[PDB]
Design a protein around this ligand. Structure first.
Ligand code: NA
Ligand code: NA
Lengths: 255, 255
């Protein structure tokens, strides 16, 4: 198997689950092994937000302070004195992986416990959110807090983006934001053939954790749901995006 | 494995594909091996019919003669003088496996050729309908005519009954008919625990081909799509429903 060779090449552990919704053909590799989900959780968080809010509710202006700012706030730190609407916060969270935006949206839906409850409701019995950004990124081997699996993350993404968990109008909003993600050019997007459309959400955490979950659309055909997770054995280890791009190539080849 | 043992005991070949839609967990065994689909095709045919006709169109009365009757017409024979509406015909085809009903419906949708085209349009590139009832049941080893695989049949059933290939209103019509099927008590239904709901369509063909495709709802949880196909080596070989009931038990345990 090619995935094992990639693990050797990049000295990392891989977690993969891909599902061609048109044929029910799958590609898996350690699909049920837990990995810190890191920022990929931002996609599922907006999914839940869209479940509880009407489109007009998203125009609601949210105010916050420099006090509310965490470690990575590309968009939010530029509007502290003006506040941002929920819609703008969802945009910043998904497309720029803005940590404060994720925290503000998390508070809007009830916190991590409420997020977990809502996920259990849609059938996700694996994803275990417990903290806010950025501490959620610090997970030690063996711990299950703030972790999930490639199969669970792909399935929950599929539930919100392709299934009936959300009305079409809201599904479209989520897909549009993710299609326009600015942080994943070197990951799944780098591993698919040209002409293929990608909607993804990246993540990076401790122990060199580097993830990307996506819905990919071949030129002609049904979407493919893909979750590629990875981690290394050193807490301070550095990741290599090439690992995800290569893993994606194998998946495409396989499918 | 358990499936290999069942094949030896019953001197048969098993084709199995099961998918838990809530977790994307699957159970497979020769999922891509071709088997004559036999009467399981009746469920796919109704799916295409509901795609073309409106709920009103279903009341469209269809008239036929004793000439239109084939080898197995439990319902259509007792209605040759008054005709039957498309809805009653779909009912007869799905719940009683009425051969004349299937043929009349096939004609309604344009014949085997149109059915195949329609299936190709929803992503099914495997199912190969070519004939009418009852000839379609006669398939020789090596032929692809009127054959499909467990994976394709399950996926196509899921598309019509669980996916947005049909408006909720029509999906429930199909599910209702299949839930009240009268021909499969000794098959998948005999292999599920108490409290589990089943919507299935049976099939029997030459070479001892005995199939059952279904959607199963556990007491609590998302539906499971399951296709259990089987065949023997001798043209006139007899089938045993116990094989399917037993195979279903393994699938459930695995899930
Ligand atoms: Na980073
Ligand atoms: Na029979």
């Amino acid at each position: 198997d090619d995935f094992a060779k990639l693990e050797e090449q990049f000295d990392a552990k891989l977690g993969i689950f891909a599902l061609d919704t048109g044929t029910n053909r799958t590609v898996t590799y350690r699909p049920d092994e837990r990995f810190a989900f890191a920022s990929t959780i931002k996609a599922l968080t907006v999914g839940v937000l869209l479940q509880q809010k009407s489109i007009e509710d998203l125009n609601q202006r949210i105010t916050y302070t420099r006090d509310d700012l965490v470690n990575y706030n590309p968009i939010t730190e530029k509007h502290v004195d003006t506040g941002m609407t929920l819609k703008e916060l969802a945009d910043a969270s998904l497309r720029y992986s803005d940590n404060t935006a994720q925290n503000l949206i998390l508070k809007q839906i009830g916190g991590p416990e409420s997020l977990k409850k809502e996920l259990r409701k849609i059938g996700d019995e694996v994803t275990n959110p417990e903290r806010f950004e950025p501490e959620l990124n610090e997970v030690n081997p063996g711990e299950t807090q703030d972790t999930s699996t490639a199969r669970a993350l792909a399935t929950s993404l599929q539930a919100f983006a392709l299934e009936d968990k959300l009305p079409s109008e809201k599904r479209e909003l989520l897909i549009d934001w993710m299609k326009r993600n600015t942080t994943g050019d070197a990951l799944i997007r780098a591993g698919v053939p040209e002409g293929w459309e990608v909607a993804d959400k990246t993540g990076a955490g401790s122990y060199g954790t580097r993830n990307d979950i996506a819905i990919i659309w071949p030129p002609k055909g049904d979407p493919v749901v893909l979750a590629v997770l990875s981690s290394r054995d050193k807490k301070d280890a550095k990741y290599d995006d090439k690992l995800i791009a290569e893993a994606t190539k194998v998946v495409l080849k396989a499918l």
